[PDB]
Design a protein around this ligand. Structure first.
Ligand SMILES: Cc1cccc(CN2C[C@@H](C(N)=O)CCC2=O)c1
Ligand SMILES: [Zn+2]
Length: 139
């Protein structure tokens, strides 16, 4: 689990969004596994606006923050899971690292801010849903 709080927005994995998130929906994309909802309180996270490919992510299944190198956001085939059938997920970045389903929501950050959140994994890989292209999160 996990979320990003920026301005009056809350960014979560679409598959983990609550009834309140869907009731206060701003934008969602199943192909990205992202959902953004509005909030009443101001958040304190800063979204990175950059092309970094190194950062640190939180892995709840290890209670550890791992430094990683990650690929640029791309369209990647993602196997079937409890929440989606087998499909291509867009804006996904991969890294060699540990991840389990419950690790979704873990933040990936670089020197500039939040880059994205854990969204996929398995086989010694971890995939992160990019949020740096969502410029409207800043205003
Ligand atoms: C983080 C992770 C590790 C291993 C396996 C998974 C599988 N998975 C894929 C997610 C998606 N974005 O398609 C939806 C929910 C889910 O359980 C995730
Ligand atoms: Zn950066």
């Amino acid at each position: 689990s996990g979320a990003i709080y920026v301005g009056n927005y809350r960014v979560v994995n679409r598959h983990l969004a609550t009834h309140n998130d869907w009731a206060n929906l701003v934008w969602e994309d199943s192909s990205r596994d992202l959902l953004v909802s509005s909030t009443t309180a101001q958040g304190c996270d800063t979204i990175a606006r950059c092309d970094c490919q190194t950062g640190v992510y939180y892995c709840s299944s290890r209670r550890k923050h791992y430094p990683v190198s990650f690929s640029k956001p791309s369209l990647i085939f993602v196997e079937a899971s409890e929440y989606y059938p087998a499909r291509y997920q867009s804006h996904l970045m991969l890294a060699v690292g540990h991840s389990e389903p419950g690790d979704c929501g873990g933040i990936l950050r670089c020197q500039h801010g939040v880059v994205g959140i854990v969204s996929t994994g398995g086989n010694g890989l971890v995939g992160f849903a990019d949020v740096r292209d969502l410029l409207w999160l800043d205003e």
